[PDB]
């Protein structure tokens with residue numbers, strides 16, 4: 001099936017806990033895969049304008065590890081719940097992708113999660129200004145704008161709203177698209 005095939009692909013790139021003990025400032029993100037109309041989508045947030053770090057920016061759900069978290073995956077799930085109302089029974093964490101090194105002292109660990117079909121996002125306005133889906137296939141043929149570095153523009157056909165996706169977030173979206181969609185029969 002589509003979902004079984006995505007999970008089997010993703011598992012081949014799972015690094016697991018290999019990098020998880022290293023003495024970094026630790027953040028985790030959840031790459032939430034949602035199946036709609038027979039195709040996979042990624043769920044993104046727009047961060048609230050009010051926040052200290054990264055205001056107004058398009059990010060996957062996530063944030064800084066805290067002492068309650070059992071592990072790095074727990075961080076990602078906690079932050080997803082606070083930001084968009086995603087409960088742990090509504091997500092299957094499939095794998096841990098390559099971590100991202102930032103600022104010499106920070107390690108960001110991405111986890112890919114399969115999202116239950118009955119999940120309905122409840123944006124928390126203290127954390128997130130918007131939540132939106134992009135079809136995974138988009139990241140194979142994105143609409144690129146050079147601001148000099150590359151920015152993706154995605155226009156939702158439901159309402160014509162354009163979103164700008166860039167940086168680590170854009171890079172991770174492309175990675176997941178390649179993993180799941182490369183070399184597939186039609």
Ligand SMILES: *CC(=O)N1CCC=CC[C@H]1c1ccc(OC)cc1
Nearest residue numbers: 027029053054058059060062063168
């Ligand atoms: C957009 C995003 O995922 N994050 C991670 C967790 C919450 C705020 C920081 C933000 C971020 C990650 C990576 C970079 O690299 C330049 C910048 C912001």
